[PDB]
Amino acid sequence: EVQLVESGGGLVKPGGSLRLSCAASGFAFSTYAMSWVRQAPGKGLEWVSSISESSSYTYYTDSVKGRFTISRDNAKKSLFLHMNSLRAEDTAVYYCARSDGLSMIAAPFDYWGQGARVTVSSASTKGPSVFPLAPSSKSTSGGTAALGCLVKDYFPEPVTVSWNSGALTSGVHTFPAVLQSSGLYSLSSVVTVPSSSLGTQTYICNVNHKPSNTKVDKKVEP
Amino acid sequence: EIVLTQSPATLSLSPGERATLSCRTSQSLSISLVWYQQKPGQAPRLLISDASNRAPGIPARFSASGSGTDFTLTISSLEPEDFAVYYCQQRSNWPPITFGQGTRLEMKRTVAAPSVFIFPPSDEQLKSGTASVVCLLNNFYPREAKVQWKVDNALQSGNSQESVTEQDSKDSTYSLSSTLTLSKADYEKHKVYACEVTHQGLSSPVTKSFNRGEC
Amino acid sequence: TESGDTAVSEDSYDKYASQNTNKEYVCDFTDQLKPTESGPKVKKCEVKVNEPLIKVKIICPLKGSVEKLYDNIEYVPKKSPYVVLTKEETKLKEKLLSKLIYGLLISPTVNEKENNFKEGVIEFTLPPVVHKATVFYFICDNSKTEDDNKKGNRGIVEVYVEPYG
Ligand SMILES: [Cl-]
Ligand SMILES: [Cl-]
Ligand SMILES: [Cl-]
Ligand SMILES: [Cl-]
Ligand SMILES: [Cl-]
Ligand SMILES: [Cl-]
Ligand SMILES: [Cl-]
Ligand SMILES: [N+]
Protein backbone atom coordinates (compact mmCIF):
# COMPACT_ATOMS: atom_id res chain seq x y z
CA GLU A 1 0.00 0.00 0.00
CA VAL A 2 2.51 2.58 1.26
CA GLN A 3 5.25 3.23 -1.26
CA LEU A 4 8.24 5.57 -1.38
CA VAL A 5 10.26 5.55 -4.61
CA GLU A 6 13.46 7.57 -4.79
CA SER A 7 15.20 8.73 -7.92
CA GLY A 8 17.99 11.10 -8.84
CA GLY A 9 21.03 9.22 -7.52
CA GLY A 10 24.33 8.85 -9.32
CA LEU A 11 27.91 10.00 -9.76
CA VAL A 12 29.13 13.52 -9.00
CA LYS A 13 32.50 15.17 -9.02
CA PRO A 14 33.48 16.78 -5.68
CA GLY A 15 31.98 20.23 -5.45
CA GLY A 16 29.15 19.09 -7.70
CA SER A 17 25.44 19.26 -7.08
CA LEU A 18 22.65 16.72 -7.23
CA ARG A 19 18.89 16.61 -6.59
CA LEU A 20 17.27 13.55 -5.04
CA SER A 21 13.53 12.88 -5.23
CA CYS A 22 11.11 10.63 -3.36
CA ALA A 23 7.68 9.95 -4.92
CA ALA A 24 5.03 8.84 -2.44
CA SER A 25 1.87 6.80 -2.81
CA GLY A 26 -0.70 4.91 -0.78
CA PHE A 27 -1.11 7.42 2.07
CA ALA A 28 -2.12 11.05 2.62
CA PHE A 29 1.38 12.54 2.08
CA SER A 30 0.51 16.05 3.33
CA THR A 31 -0.13 14.78 6.91
CA TYR A 32 3.27 13.14 7.53
CA ALA A 33 6.76 14.28 8.24
CA MET A 34 9.37 13.19 5.68
CA SER A 35 13.12 12.66 6.19
CA TRP A 36 16.39 11.77 4.49
CA VAL A 37 18.68 9.24 6.21
CA ARG A 38 22.00 8.27 4.65
CA GLN A 39 24.17 5.17 4.84
CA ALA A 40 27.84 5.41 3.85
CA PRO A 41 29.50 2.27 2.32
CA GLY A 42 30.40 -0.13 5.15
CA LYS A 43 28.75 2.17 7.69
CA GLY A 44 25.52 2.52 9.63
CA LEU A 45 22.67 5.01 9.45
CA GLU A 46 22.99 8.78 9.72
CA TRP A 47 20.05 11.16 9.87
CA VAL A 48 20.44 13.97 7.34
CA SER A 49 17.34 16.07 7.26
CA SER A 50 13.66 16.29 8.18
CA ILE A 51 10.71 18.37 7.01
CA SER A 52 7.27 18.75 8.65
CA GLU A 53 3.97 18.16 6.81
CA SER A 54 3.35 21.74 5.56
CA SER A 55 7.10 22.68 5.51
CA SER A 56 6.95 24.96 8.57
CA TYR A 57 9.84 23.07 10.24
CA THR A 58 13.07 21.91 8.61
CA TYR A 59 15.93 20.25 10.44
CA TYR A 60 19.47 19.43 9.38
CA THR A 61 22.48 17.57 10.65
CA ASP A 62 25.41 19.95 11.14
CA SER A 63 27.67 18.64 8.36
CA VAL A 64 25.08 19.36 5.64
CA LYS A 65 23.94 22.79 6.93
CA GLY A 66 24.37 25.40 4.24
CA ARG A 67 24.94 22.74 1.58
CA PHE A 68 21.72 20.68 1.56
CA THR A 69 18.10 21.88 1.28
CA ILE A 70 15.13 19.63 2.02
CA SER A 71 11.79 20.49 0.40
CA ARG A 72 8.44 18.97 -0.52
CA ASP A 73 5.45 19.45 -2.82
CA ASN A 74 2.23 18.04 -1.38
CA ALA A 75 0.33 18.42 -4.67
CA LYS A 76 2.95 16.36 -6.56
CA LYS A 77 3.34 13.94 -3.59
CA SER A 78 7.10 14.54 -3.72
CA LEU A 79 10.05 15.02 -1.33
CA PHE A 80 13.35 16.59 -2.47
CA LEU A 81 16.93 16.85 -1.24
CA HIS A 82 18.96 19.43 -3.13
CA MET A 83 22.68 18.71 -2.38
CA ASN A 84 25.26 21.37 -3.28
CA SER A 85 29.03 21.45 -2.61
CA LEU A 86 29.28 17.70 -2.43
CA ARG A 87 32.24 16.17 -0.63
CA ALA A 88 33.49 12.56 -0.63
CA GLU A 89 31.98 12.09 2.88
CA ASP A 90 28.50 12.55 1.33
CA THR A 91 28.93 9.20 -0.49
CA ALA A 92 26.02 7.09 0.73
CA VAL A 93 22.78 5.41 -0.13
CA TYR A 94 20.09 8.01 0.67
CA TYR A 95 16.75 6.88 2.06
CA CYS A 96 13.56 8.85 2.26
CA ALA A 97 11.50 7.96 5.32
CA ARG A 98 8.02 8.77 6.58
CA SER A 99 7.18 9.60 10.19
CA ASP A 100 4.05 10.79 11.96
CA GLY A 101 5.64 14.02 13.11
CA LEU A 102 8.60 16.05 14.30
CA SER A 103 7.77 16.92 17.88
CA MET A 104 10.30 16.98 20.72
CA ILE A 105 9.69 13.29 20.85
CA ALA A 106 10.16 12.67 17.15
CA ALA A 107 8.06 9.94 15.59
CA PRO A 108 9.75 6.72 14.33
CA PHE A 109 10.60 6.28 10.69
CA ASP A 110 7.85 3.80 9.89
CA TYR A 111 8.26 3.49 6.11
CA TRP A 112 11.41 3.77 4.07
CA GLY A 113 12.13 4.21 0.40
CA GLN A 114 14.40 1.81 -1.48
CA GLY A 115 17.46 4.05 -1.45
CA ALA A 116 19.37 6.10 -4.00
CA ARG A 117 23.13 5.74 -4.34
CA VAL A 118 25.17 8.96 -4.37
CA THR A 119 28.88 8.52 -5.17
CA VAL A 120 31.06 11.62 -4.93
CA SER A 121 34.35 10.84 -6.65
CA SER A 122 36.91 12.39 -8.97
CA ALA A 123 37.23 9.11 -10.91
CA SER A 124 35.91 8.71 -14.47
CA THR A 125 33.96 5.67 -15.60
CA LYS A 126 36.35 2.82 -16.43
CA GLY A 127 36.05 -0.73 -17.67
CA PRO A 128 37.73 -3.48 -15.68
CA SER A 129 40.83 -5.48 -16.44
CA VAL A 130 40.27 -9.20 -15.92
CA PHE A 131 43.26 -11.37 -14.94
CA PRO A 132 43.30 -15.10 -14.15
CA LEU A 133 43.92 -16.44 -10.68
CA ALA A 134 45.28 -19.64 -12.13
CA PRO A 135 44.89 -23.06 -10.49
CA SER A 136 48.41 -24.12 -9.69
CA SER A 137 47.92 -27.87 -8.84
CA LYS A 138 50.18 -27.61 -5.77
CA SER A 139 49.46 -24.25 -4.07
CA THR A 140 45.79 -24.10 -5.02
CA SER A 141 45.14 -27.88 -4.50
CA GLY A 142 44.11 -29.85 -1.37
CA GLY A 143 42.20 -32.60 -3.24
CA THR A 144 39.96 -29.86 -4.64
CA ALA A 145 41.45 -27.04 -6.73
CA ALA A 146 40.62 -23.35 -6.30
CA LEU A 147 40.70 -20.96 -9.25
CA GLY A 148 39.41 -17.51 -9.95
CA CYS A 149 39.77 -14.26 -11.75
CA LEU A 150 40.65 -10.78 -10.55
CA VAL A 151 38.44 -7.92 -11.71
CA LYS A 152 40.57 -4.84 -11.17
CA ASP A 153 40.44 -1.05 -11.75
CA TYR A 154 36.82 -0.37 -12.68
CA PHE A 155 34.50 2.50 -11.82
CA PRO A 156 31.75 2.70 -10.63
CA GLU A 157 30.12 -0.26 -8.92
CA PRO A 158 28.78 -2.88 -9.91
CA VAL A 159 30.23 -5.74 -11.94
CA THR A 160 28.61 -9.13 -12.43
CA VAL A 161 30.72 -12.29 -12.60
CA SER A 162 29.36 -15.60 -13.90
CA TRP A 163 31.41 -18.70 -14.50
CA ASN A 164 30.43 -21.32 -17.09
CA SER A 165 27.89 -19.03 -18.72
CA GLY A 166 25.80 -19.48 -15.56
CA ALA A 167 26.21 -23.27 -15.33
CA LEU A 168 28.91 -23.23 -12.60
CA THR A 169 27.28 -21.77 -9.49
CA SER A 170 28.06 -24.10 -6.57
CA GLY A 171 31.30 -23.20 -4.78
CA VAL A 172 31.42 -19.72 -6.34
CA HIS A 173 32.38 -16.86 -4.06
CA THR A 174 32.34 -13.43 -5.65
CA PHE A 175 33.83 -11.02 -3.16
CA PRO A 176 32.56 -7.52 -2.28
CA ALA A 177 34.36 -4.78 -4.16
CA VAL A 178 37.13 -2.97 -2.34
CA LEU A 179 37.80 0.65 -3.19
CA GLN A 180 41.53 1.08 -3.87
CA SER A 181 43.53 4.26 -3.19
CA SER A 182 43.39 4.99 -6.94
CA GLY A 183 39.65 5.51 -6.47
CA LEU A 184 38.87 2.45 -8.59
CA TYR A 185 37.27 -0.78 -7.51
CA SER A 186 38.56 -4.33 -7.44
CA LEU A 187 37.07 -7.72 -6.60
CA SER A 188 38.00 -11.30 -7.22
CA SER A 189 35.72 -14.17 -8.03
CA VAL A 190 36.79 -17.67 -6.95
CA VAL A 191 35.45 -21.20 -7.41
CA THR A 192 36.54 -24.57 -6.03
CA VAL A 193 36.53 -27.32 -8.71
CA PRO A 194 37.81 -30.91 -8.60
CA SER A 195 41.58 -30.89 -9.22
CA SER A 196 41.11 -33.97 -11.41
CA SER A 197 38.84 -31.88 -13.70
CA LEU A 198 41.61 -29.27 -14.43
CA GLY A 199 42.95 -31.34 -17.32
CA THR A 200 39.54 -31.66 -18.98
CA GLN A 201 37.10 -28.93 -17.90
CA THR A 202 37.15 -25.46 -19.43
CA TYR A 203 36.83 -22.50 -17.01
CA ILE A 204 35.93 -19.01 -18.23
CA CYS A 205 34.79 -16.08 -16.13
CA ASN A 206 32.14 -13.81 -17.59
CA VAL A 207 32.59 -10.31 -16.20
CA ASN A 208 30.21 -7.54 -17.19
CA HIS A 209 30.50 -3.87 -16.19
CA LYS A 210 27.34 -2.14 -17.45
CA PRO A 211 28.57 1.54 -17.09
CA SER A 212 31.32 1.07 -19.68
CA ASN A 213 29.24 -1.66 -21.48
CA THR A 214 32.28 -3.90 -20.92
CA LYS A 215 31.62 -7.63 -21.29
CA VAL A 216 34.82 -9.68 -20.89
CA ASP A 217 35.25 -13.45 -20.92
CA LYS A 218 38.61 -14.66 -19.61
CA LYS A 219 39.69 -18.29 -19.72
CA VAL A 220 41.37 -19.46 -16.48
CA GLU A 221 43.94 -22.25 -17.31
CA PRO A 222 46.53 -24.08 -15.16
CA GLU B 1 24.78 15.08 20.32
CA ILE B 2 23.68 11.82 21.95
CA VAL B 3 26.09 9.04 21.00
CA LEU B 4 24.50 5.57 21.04
CA THR B 5 26.85 2.58 21.46
CA GLN B 6 25.47 -0.76 20.39
CA SER B 7 26.81 -3.83 22.11
CA PRO B 8 28.02 -6.43 21.15
CA ALA B 9 29.16 -5.50 17.65
CA THR B 10 28.31 -9.06 16.51
CA LEU B 11 26.04 -11.59 18.21
CA SER B 12 26.49 -15.26 17.28
CA LEU B 13 23.38 -17.31 18.01
CA SER B 14 21.36 -20.31 16.80
CA PRO B 15 17.66 -20.05 15.84
CA GLY B 16 15.23 -20.59 18.67
CA GLU B 17 17.49 -18.78 21.16
CA ARG B 18 16.75 -15.49 22.88
CA ALA B 19 18.78 -12.63 21.44
CA THR B 20 19.67 -9.69 23.67
CA LEU B 21 21.00 -6.56 22.03
CA SER B 22 22.18 -3.61 24.05
CA CYS B 23 22.23 0.08 23.21
CA ARG B 24 24.01 2.43 25.56
CA THR B 25 23.40 6.16 25.40
CA SER B 26 26.02 8.81 26.21
CA GLN B 27 23.41 10.76 28.24
CA SER B 28 20.48 9.47 30.29
CA LEU B 29 17.14 9.24 28.39
CA SER B 30 13.64 8.73 29.82
CA ILE B 31 11.88 8.44 26.45
CA SER B 32 12.23 5.04 24.77
CA LEU B 33 14.42 4.23 21.78
CA VAL B 34 13.33 3.11 18.32
CA TRP B 35 14.74 -0.08 16.74
CA TYR B 36 15.25 -0.97 13.03
CA GLN B 37 16.37 -4.06 11.09
CA GLN B 38 18.48 -4.17 7.91
CA LYS B 39 19.09 -7.26 5.77
CA PRO B 40 21.93 -6.93 3.18
CA GLY B 41 21.19 -4.94 0.06
CA GLN B 42 17.88 -3.81 1.55
CA ALA B 43 16.45 -0.67 3.05
CA PRO B 44 16.05 -0.55 6.83
CA ARG B 45 12.58 -1.24 8.15
CA LEU B 46 10.99 -0.15 11.45
CA LEU B 47 10.77 -2.86 14.03
CA ILE B 48 9.73 -1.44 17.35
CA SER B 49 8.96 2.03 18.76
CA ASP B 50 8.29 1.63 22.53
CA ALA B 51 7.97 -1.34 24.89
CA SER B 52 5.53 -3.09 22.50
CA ASN B 53 4.86 -0.71 19.57
CA ARG B 54 5.79 -3.03 16.76
CA ALA B 55 5.31 -1.81 13.19
CA PRO B 56 2.80 -3.44 10.79
CA GLY B 57 4.01 -6.89 9.85
CA ILE B 58 6.53 -7.06 12.71
CA PRO B 59 5.89 -10.20 14.81
CA ALA B 60 5.55 -10.39 18.59
CA ARG B 61 9.00 -11.95 19.28
CA PHE B 62 10.55 -8.44 19.17
CA SER B 63 10.27 -6.55 22.48
CA ALA B 64 12.16 -3.52 23.72
CA SER B 65 13.00 -2.16 27.15
CA GLY B 66 15.39 -0.07 29.16
CA SER B 67 15.79 3.43 30.52
CA GLY B 68 18.39 5.86 31.78
CA THR B 69 21.46 4.87 29.86
CA ASP B 70 20.84 1.14 29.24
CA PHE B 71 18.48 -0.16 26.59
CA THR B 72 17.88 -3.62 25.19
CA LEU B 73 16.12 -5.13 22.20
CA THR B 74 15.01 -8.71 22.81
CA ILE B 75 14.19 -11.30 20.16
CA SER B 76 12.62 -14.03 22.24
CA SER B 77 13.26 -16.87 19.80
CA LEU B 78 15.25 -16.23 16.66
CA GLU B 79 14.01 -17.14 13.25
CA PRO B 80 16.44 -17.62 10.29
CA GLU B 81 14.95 -14.37 8.85
CA ASP B 82 16.23 -12.47 11.91
CA PHE B 83 19.96 -12.73 11.14
CA ALA B 84 20.46 -9.13 10.09
CA VAL B 85 21.83 -5.81 11.34
CA TYR B 86 19.89 -3.99 14.12
CA TYR B 87 20.04 -0.22 14.75
CA CYS B 88 18.78 1.62 17.80
CA GLN B 89 17.87 5.28 17.45
CA GLN B 90 16.97 8.04 19.88
CA ARG B 91 14.17 10.48 19.01
CA SER B 92 13.98 12.69 22.08
CA ASN B 93 17.13 14.80 22.47
CA TRP B 94 17.28 16.14 18.94
CA PRO B 95 18.41 17.69 16.46
CA PRO B 96 20.44 15.69 15.56
CA ILE B 97 18.46 12.50 15.48
CA THR B 98 21.16 9.89 16.09
CA PHE B 99 21.51 6.16 15.53
CA GLY B 100 23.65 3.48 17.05
CA GLN B 101 26.31 1.94 14.87
CA GLY B 102 24.62 -1.44 14.45
CA THR B 103 24.85 -4.94 15.88
CA ARG B 104 25.17 -7.75 13.32
CA LEU B 105 23.28 -10.91 14.24
CA GLU B 106 25.24 -13.88 12.84
CA MET B 107 24.31 -17.57 12.81
CA LYS B 108 26.42 -19.73 15.12
CA ARG B 109 27.83 -22.98 13.77
CA THR B 110 30.68 -25.32 14.58
CA VAL B 111 34.26 -24.20 14.00
CA ALA B 112 35.42 -24.72 10.43
CA ALA B 113 39.03 -24.23 9.37
CA PRO B 114 39.70 -22.41 6.07
CA SER B 115 41.21 -23.89 2.98
CA VAL B 116 44.08 -21.62 1.98
CA PHE B 117 45.17 -20.98 -1.59
CA ILE B 118 47.69 -18.55 -3.03
CA PHE B 119 47.56 -17.17 -6.56
CA PRO B 120 50.61 -15.66 -8.29
CA PRO B 121 50.20 -12.69 -10.67
CA SER B 122 49.41 -13.55 -14.26
CA ASP B 123 51.75 -12.66 -17.12
CA GLU B 124 48.95 -10.48 -18.54
CA GLN B 125 48.84 -8.43 -15.32
CA LEU B 126 52.66 -8.29 -15.22
CA LYS B 127 52.68 -6.53 -18.63
CA SER B 128 50.72 -3.63 -17.04
CA GLY B 129 53.38 -2.88 -14.40
CA THR B 130 51.39 -4.08 -11.37
CA ALA B 131 51.52 -7.48 -9.68
CA SER B 132 48.64 -8.75 -7.54
CA VAL B 133 49.13 -11.76 -5.26
CA VAL B 134 45.88 -13.19 -3.89
CA CYS B 135 45.36 -15.42 -0.84
CA LEU B 136 42.03 -17.19 -0.47
CA LEU B 137 40.52 -18.59 2.69
CA ASN B 138 37.53 -20.73 1.72
CA ASN B 139 34.60 -21.83 3.93
CA PHE B 140 35.65 -21.01 7.49
CA TYR B 141 33.84 -20.23 10.77
CA PRO B 142 34.19 -17.93 12.78
CA ARG B 143 35.04 -14.80 10.77
CA GLU B 144 38.09 -13.97 12.99
CA ALA B 145 41.19 -14.77 10.93
CA LYS B 146 44.67 -13.29 10.66
CA VAL B 147 46.35 -13.22 7.26
CA GLN B 148 49.93 -12.02 6.92
CA TRP B 149 51.88 -11.51 3.70
CA LYS B 150 55.59 -12.33 3.66
CA VAL B 151 57.87 -11.53 0.74
CA ASP B 152 61.33 -13.17 1.19
CA ASN B 153 60.32 -13.55 4.88
CA ALA B 154 59.76 -9.79 5.28
CA LEU B 155 56.32 -8.97 6.69
CA GLN B 156 54.20 -6.82 4.36
CA SER B 157 52.40 -3.83 5.83
CA GLY B 158 49.94 -1.34 4.34
CA ASN B 159 49.90 -2.89 0.81
CA SER B 160 47.19 -5.57 1.11
CA GLN B 161 43.37 -5.29 1.18
CA GLU B 162 40.90 -7.84 2.52
CA SER B 163 37.38 -8.66 1.40
CA VAL B 164 35.04 -10.99 3.31
CA THR B 165 31.87 -12.53 1.96
CA GLU B 166 28.51 -12.36 3.63
CA GLN B 167 27.78 -15.40 5.78
CA ASP B 168 26.69 -18.21 3.44
CA SER B 169 22.98 -19.08 3.72
CA LYS B 170 23.50 -22.82 3.18
CA ASP B 171 26.46 -23.65 5.53
CA SER B 172 27.10 -20.46 7.65
CA THR B 173 30.75 -20.08 6.61
CA TYR B 174 32.80 -17.14 5.38
CA SER B 175 35.40 -16.73 2.68
CA LEU B 176 38.12 -14.13 2.60
CA SER B 177 40.49 -12.78 -0.02
CA SER B 178 43.67 -10.89 0.80
CA THR B 179 45.23 -9.04 -2.13
CA LEU B 180 48.82 -7.84 -1.97
CA THR B 181 49.50 -5.30 -4.73
CA LEU B 182 53.12 -4.56 -5.70
CA SER B 183 54.79 -2.86 -8.61
CA LYS B 184 56.32 -5.14 -11.28
CA ALA B 185 59.83 -3.95 -10.33
CA ASP B 186 59.30 -4.77 -6.65
CA TYR B 187 57.70 -8.08 -7.66
CA GLU B 188 60.73 -9.36 -9.54
CA LYS B 189 63.20 -8.10 -6.89
CA HIS B 190 62.22 -11.07 -4.68
CA LYS B 191 61.69 -14.83 -4.82
CA VAL B 192 59.26 -16.30 -2.23
CA TYR B 193 55.72 -15.04 -1.75
CA ALA B 194 53.93 -16.40 1.28
CA CYS B 195 50.52 -16.14 2.89
CA GLU B 196 50.23 -17.02 6.61
CA VAL B 197 46.79 -17.78 8.04
CA THR B 198 45.97 -17.98 11.73
CA HIS B 199 42.51 -19.29 12.64
CA GLN B 200 40.86 -21.01 15.61
CA GLY B 201 40.11 -24.16 13.55
CA LEU B 202 43.76 -24.60 12.52
CA SER B 203 46.00 -26.48 14.98
CA SER B 204 48.93 -24.40 13.68
CA PRO B 205 48.96 -21.40 11.29
CA VAL B 206 48.95 -22.45 7.68
CA THR B 207 51.54 -21.06 5.25
CA LYS B 208 50.92 -21.17 1.49
CA SER B 209 53.85 -19.97 -0.60
CA PHE B 210 55.30 -19.99 -4.06
CA ASN B 211 58.57 -19.10 -5.74
CA ARG B 212 58.30 -16.49 -8.50
CA GLY B 213 59.39 -18.08 -11.74
CA GLU B 214 57.63 -21.40 -10.89
CA CYS B 215 60.33 -22.72 -8.50
CA THR C 1 12.02 37.59 28.54
CA GLU C 2 11.97 34.77 25.97
CA SER C 3 15.64 33.77 25.88
CA GLY C 4 16.08 34.59 29.58
CA ASP C 5 19.48 34.82 31.24
CA THR C 6 20.76 32.44 28.52
CA ALA C 7 22.61 34.05 25.62
CA VAL C 8 20.82 32.27 22.76
CA SER C 9 19.85 34.19 19.61
CA GLU C 10 16.44 33.50 18.05
CA ASP C 11 17.92 31.72 15.01
CA SER C 12 19.88 29.41 17.41
CA TYR C 13 16.63 28.19 19.01
CA ASP C 14 15.34 24.69 18.34
CA LYS C 15 11.65 25.07 17.48
CA TYR C 16 9.17 22.22 17.27
CA ALA C 17 5.47 21.68 16.79
CA SER C 18 3.49 19.98 19.54
CA GLN C 19 2.50 16.34 19.01
CA ASN C 20 -1.12 16.65 17.93
CA THR C 21 -3.15 13.47 18.23
CA ASN C 22 -6.92 13.06 18.71
CA LYS C 23 -7.63 16.74 19.60
CA GLU C 24 -4.88 16.68 22.29
CA TYR C 25 -1.75 18.78 21.67
CA VAL C 26 1.28 17.76 23.75
CA CYS C 27 4.54 19.52 24.68
CA ASP C 28 6.82 16.92 26.32
CA PHE C 29 10.08 18.40 27.56
CA THR C 30 11.29 15.41 29.61
CA ASP C 31 14.38 14.56 27.52
CA GLN C 32 14.92 17.78 25.62
CA LEU C 33 15.97 19.93 28.65
CA LYS C 34 18.66 17.69 30.22
CA PRO C 35 22.24 19.04 30.56
CA THR C 36 24.03 18.92 27.20
CA GLU C 37 27.57 20.15 26.46
CA SER C 38 26.36 22.68 23.89
CA GLY C 39 23.99 24.09 26.51
CA PRO C 40 22.18 26.28 27.26
CA LYS C 41 19.88 25.90 24.25
CA VAL C 42 16.35 27.17 23.82
CA LYS C 43 13.81 24.43 23.09
CA LYS C 44 10.60 26.06 21.86
CA CYS C 45 7.37 24.06 21.47
CA GLU C 46 4.79 25.79 19.28
CA VAL C 47 1.09 25.05 19.84
CA LYS C 48 -0.98 26.39 16.92
CA VAL C 49 -4.72 26.24 17.57
CA ASN C 50 -7.30 26.83 14.80
CA GLU C 51 -9.74 24.05 15.74
CA PRO C 52 -12.37 23.65 18.48
CA LEU C 53 -11.99 21.76 21.78
CA ILE C 54 -8.23 21.33 21.82
CA LYS C 55 -6.73 20.05 25.07
CA VAL C 56 -3.21 21.42 25.52
CA LYS C 57 -0.91 19.26 27.67
CA ILE C 58 2.50 20.48 28.84
CA ILE C 59 4.88 17.98 30.45
CA CYS C 60 7.72 19.66 32.31
CA PRO C 61 10.19 17.42 34.21
CA LEU C 62 10.38 17.70 37.97
CA LYS C 63 13.31 18.38 40.30
CA GLY C 64 14.70 15.05 41.40
CA SER C 65 12.67 13.01 38.89
CA VAL C 66 16.03 11.86 37.57
CA GLU C 67 18.86 12.45 40.06
CA LYS C 68 21.16 15.48 39.48
CA LEU C 69 19.66 16.45 36.11
CA TYR C 70 16.84 18.81 37.15
CA ASP C 71 18.29 20.15 40.40
CA ASN C 72 17.73 23.81 39.48
CA ILE C 73 14.69 23.52 37.24
CA GLU C 74 12.18 26.38 37.51
CA TYR C 75 8.83 26.94 35.81
CA VAL C 76 7.23 30.32 35.21
CA PRO C 77 4.32 31.09 35.88
CA LYS C 78 4.12 29.20 39.17
CA LYS C 79 0.31 29.23 38.96
CA SER C 80 0.16 27.71 35.46
CA PRO C 81 -2.11 27.18 33.50
CA TYR C 82 -4.42 29.66 35.23
CA VAL C 83 -1.69 32.32 34.93
CA VAL C 84 0.31 32.57 31.68
CA LEU C 85 2.94 34.92 30.28
CA THR C 86 2.11 37.41 27.54
CA LYS C 87 4.63 39.39 25.56
CA GLU C 88 3.89 43.07 25.54
CA GLU C 89 6.37 45.35 23.73
CA THR C 90 9.83 44.40 25.07
CA LYS C 91 8.34 42.74 28.18
CA LEU C 92 6.91 39.49 29.57
CA LYS C 93 3.92 40.02 31.89
CA GLU C 94 1.84 37.45 33.78
CA LYS C 95 -1.86 37.46 32.85
CA LEU C 96 -4.97 35.39 33.61
CA LEU C 97 -5.91 32.76 31.05
CA SER C 98 -9.67 33.09 31.82
CA LYS C 99 -9.36 36.80 30.92
CA LEU C 100 -7.54 36.20 27.61
CA ILE C 101 -9.73 33.31 26.36
CA TYR C 102 -13.47 33.30 27.06
CA GLY C 103 -15.06 29.90 27.67
CA LEU C 104 -11.81 28.29 28.74
CA LEU C 105 -11.85 25.20 30.94
CA ILE C 106 -8.99 24.21 33.21
CA SER C 107 -9.67 20.93 34.90
CA PRO C 108 -8.54 20.94 38.55
CA THR C 109 -7.18 17.37 38.17
CA VAL C 110 -5.00 15.88 35.47
CA ASN C 111 -4.36 12.23 36.36
CA GLU C 112 -5.79 12.41 39.93
CA LYS C 113 -2.97 14.85 40.75
CA GLU C 114 -3.21 18.63 40.81
CA ASN C 115 -3.21 20.66 37.56
CA ASN C 116 -0.02 22.52 38.42
CA PHE C 117 3.57 22.17 37.21
CA LYS C 118 4.65 20.85 40.64
CA GLU C 119 2.95 17.58 39.67
CA GLY C 120 4.89 17.71 36.37
CA VAL C 121 2.02 18.17 33.92
CA ILE C 122 -0.35 21.05 33.26
CA GLU C 123 -3.37 20.90 31.02
CA PHE C 124 -6.21 23.09 29.76
CA THR C 125 -9.11 22.87 27.30
CA LEU C 126 -9.99 25.49 24.65
CA PRO C 127 -13.65 26.52 23.97
CA PRO C 128 -15.77 25.64 20.87
CA VAL C 129 -15.54 29.20 19.49
CA VAL C 130 -12.76 31.78 19.70
CA HIS C 131 -13.20 35.23 18.17
CA LYS C 132 -9.93 36.80 19.39
CA ALA C 133 -6.38 35.82 18.39
CA THR C 134 -4.10 35.36 21.43
CA VAL C 135 -0.46 34.36 21.90
CA PHE C 136 0.73 33.27 25.35
CA TYR C 137 3.74 31.53 26.86
CA PHE C 138 5.05 29.14 29.48
CA ILE C 139 8.65 28.66 30.62
CA CYS C 140 10.19 25.37 31.80
CA ASP C 141 13.83 26.42 32.47
CA ASN C 142 16.61 23.91 33.23
CA SER C 143 19.49 26.22 32.21
CA LYS C 144 20.79 26.78 35.73
CA THR C 145 21.25 23.02 36.22
CA GLU C 146 24.88 22.02 35.76
CA ASP C 147 26.25 18.47 35.74
CA ASP C 148 29.74 17.45 34.45
CA ASN C 149 30.37 20.99 32.95
CA LYS C 150 27.15 20.60 30.87
CA LYS C 151 24.31 23.12 31.21
CA GLY C 152 20.59 22.42 30.86
CA ASN C 153 18.20 24.05 28.45
CA ARG C 154 15.48 26.63 28.52
CA GLY C 155 12.08 25.35 27.38
CA ILE C 156 9.44 27.67 25.90
CA VAL C 157 5.82 26.87 25.08
CA GLU C 158 4.18 29.38 22.75
CA VAL C 159 0.43 28.90 22.31
CA TYR C 160 -1.12 30.62 19.29
CA VAL C 161 -4.90 30.66 19.35
CA GLU C 162 -6.16 31.67 15.96
CA PRO C 163 -9.84 32.62 15.64
CA TYR C 164 -12.10 29.64 14.93
CA GLY C 165 -15.74 28.55 15.06
CL1 LIG D 1 -2.67 6.95 -3.60
CL1 LIG E 1 -3.27 7.62 5.35
CL1 LIG F 1 -2.50 13.87 0.27
CL1 LIG G 1 3.38 -7.50 24.10
CL1 LIG H 1 1.73 -6.58 17.70
CL1 LIG I 1 29.34 -28.21 7.49
CL1 LIG J 1 52.37 -24.38 -0.17
N1 LIG K 1 3.82 22.14 9.25
Author numbering:
A (entry chain A): 1 to 52, 52A, 53 to 82, 82A, 82B, 82C, 83 to 100, 100A, ...
B (entry chain B): 1 to 95, 95A, 96 to 214
C (entry chain C): 567 to 731
Study text:
Pfs230 is essential for Plasmodium falciparum transmission to mosquitoes and is the protein targeted by the most advanced malaria-transmission-blocking vaccine candidate. Pfs230 is a 363 kDa secreted protein containing 14 six-cysteine (6-Cys) domains and is important for gamete adherence to human red blood cells and subsequent oocyst formation. Transmission-reducing activity (TRA) by antibodies elicited in mice has been found to target the N-terminal region of the protein, and the clinical Pfs230-based candidate immunogen contains the first 6-Cys domain of Pfs230 with a segment of its N-terminal pro-domain (referred to as D1M, amino acids 542–736). To elucidate the structural basis of antibody-mediated inhibition across a range of potencies, we determined the crystal structures of six antibodies in complexes with Pfs230 D1.
